[PDB]
Amino acid sequence: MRGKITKINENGLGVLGNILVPFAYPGDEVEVTETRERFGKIIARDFKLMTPSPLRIPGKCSHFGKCGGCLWQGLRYREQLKLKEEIFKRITGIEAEIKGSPRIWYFRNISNFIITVNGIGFKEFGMPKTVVNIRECPIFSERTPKYLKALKDFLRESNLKPWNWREGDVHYLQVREGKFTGEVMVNIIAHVPLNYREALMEAFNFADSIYWSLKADKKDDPRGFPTLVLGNEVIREKVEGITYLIHPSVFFQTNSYALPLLLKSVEKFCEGSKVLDLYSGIGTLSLYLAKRGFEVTGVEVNGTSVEMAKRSAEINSINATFIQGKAEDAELEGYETLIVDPPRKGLKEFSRRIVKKGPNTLIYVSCNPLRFILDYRNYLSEAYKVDDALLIDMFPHTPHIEAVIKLVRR
């Protein structure tokens, strides 16, 4: 099958009739040789690029369909941004403008490198994979080669078996950086206890924090019961003059460079002074808002995250409240604005509670617009209507989108 790629689909794959072609983009003239059935979709196993779309970076990226590394690496950056606006609108029927990442290389502040018998890779969960070789798409750090050399040296000295997909001593090397502080946390994720304390400390002597996280299951997901091996308990990231604390056990917004744009977006959409920030994390939005004079209550399920937020508040002299709990059970009355940042599965049934008891301004933060619009169509629209929306490109070179949607009551 030969033809011209007409659009990209929701997951950022180029469409060729009833074929999906990874790394092909709109305008490409392609020739597909092998396809593979994938849960009722036909996906191109490889293609030859006959004619480059005008969207591609001129050079090698206009001669080969797969320049390398990242699914969208071959698209010029401005052109990726417009394709993100298109997808968002196609999914939600909202026209939202996107703000680019101030920096489009080495922007992520975390990486879970999986350690396999086939060697070390950037892990991502889910099947239209978007970062397939981090050597040809350096989205994380300039120190990545030093992080990996260290790990290899440690696996030498500590004779320790990688993940062979059924078992293995070690499983992931998690590295986290504070982009604006220099601090580096190293978190080995393992299926055995640490024996080579000295070998590990030596290999990662440059890290400010070394952890060893013990997994109690064999599942392929990067989480444990962490043990400080050496150095600081946490690392610091600094954004908009706010010191945030990062622990192996917590989630933090992924792009320290685009994060000011997410913070100012949310602020622009706030209404009144009393803000409830559910899924409040290690205080990313809450501290930013409260520091700017909002009265801010944040609720987060992860207890370690909530501690981090409390400590940040002290460090920064911010006046705000932080509570452990599930967003499902937080009291919504008495507020002017509600922010939600749900996980990928969305609000789900919490929407009925928001429909009844929610405040006048609802702000919804979603890295997954298909799930947003479904929450909206299925529940929120009863009570709410979209008033405004912005996009932030937190994940350059890949089709992922971070949306900030402002809804108000009818």
Annotated binding site for S-adenosyl-L-methionine: 253, 279, 300, 341
CA 245 to chain centre: 18
Question: Given 258, 285, 367, 407, which residue is catalytic?
Answer: 367
Q: Answer yes or no whether residue 101 interacts with Na ion by CB under 5 A.
A: no
Are 6 and 28 within 8 A, CB to CB?
no
CA distances (Å), origin 143, targets 64, 110, 155:
28, 12, 19
Q: Which CB sits closer to Na ion, 176 or 291?
A: 176
DSSP lists the bridge partners of residue 2 as: 31
Q: Which CB sits closer to Na ion, 5 or 110?
A: 110
Q: Exactly one of 3, 27, 138, 343 binds Na ion (CB under 5 A); which one?
A: 138
Q: Answer yes or no whether residue 140 interacts with Na ion by CB under 5 A.
A: yes
Q: Answer yes or no whether residue 395 interacts with Na ion by CB under 5 A.
A: no
How many of the chain's residues bind Na ion (CB under 5 A)?
4
Q: Reply yes or no on whether 367 is catalytic.
A: yes
Distance of closest approach, residue 123 Cβ to Na ion, in angstroms: 13
Return the range that interacts with Na ion (CB under 5 A); candidates 28-36, 133-141, 214-222, 329-337: 133-141
Return the range that interacts with Na ion (CB under 5 A); candidates 141-149, 206-214, 276-284, 398-406: 141-149
Distance of closest approach, residue 176 Cβ to Na ion, in angstroms: 13
How far apart CA 351 and CA 216 sit, in angstroms, is 34
Q: Answer yes or no whether residue 284 interacts with Na ion by CB under 5 A.
A: no
Distance of closest approach, residue 140 Cβ to Na ion, in angstroms: 4
Distance of closest approach, residue 105 Cβ to Na ion, in angstroms: 8
Distance of closest approach, residue 222 Cβ to Na ion, in angstroms: 17
Return the range that interacts with Na ion (CB under 5 A); candidates 40-48, 139-147, 234-242, 326-334: 139-147
Return the range that interacts with Na ion (CB under 5 A); candidates 14-22, 57-65, 136-144, 194-202: 136-144
Return the range that interacts with Na ion (CB under 5 A); candidates 27-35, 128-136, 241-249, 335-343: 128-136
Q: Answer yes or no whether residue 144 interacts with Na ion by CB under 5 A.
A: yes
Q: Which amino acid is at 368?
A: N
Are 108 and 138 within 8 A, CB to CB?
no
Distance of closest approach, residue 143 Cβ to Na ion, in angstroms: 8
How far apart CA 254 and CA 251 sit, in angstroms, is 8
Binding-site members are 61, 67, 70, 137, 253, 279, 300, 341
Q: Which CB sits closer to Na ion, 13 or 134?
A: 134
Q: How many residues does the chain have?
A: 410
Q: Which amino acid is at 267?
A: E
How far apart CA 263 and CA 142 sit, in angstroms, is 26
Q: Which CB sits closer to Na ion, 101 or 249?
A: 101
DSSP lists the bridge partners of residue 52 as: none
Output the CA torsion sign for 147, 148, 149, 152. Answer: positive
Binding-site members for [4Fe-4S] cluster are 61, 67, 70, 137
Binding mask 12-31 vs Na ion (x if CB under 5 A, - otherwise)?
--------------------
Q: Which amino acid is at 204?
A: F
Q: Which CB sits closer to Na ion, 70 or 339?
A: 70
Q: Which CB sits closer to Na ion, 72 or 140?
A: 140
The residues binding Na ion (CB under 5 A) are 134, 138, 140, 144
Catalytic residue IDs: 367
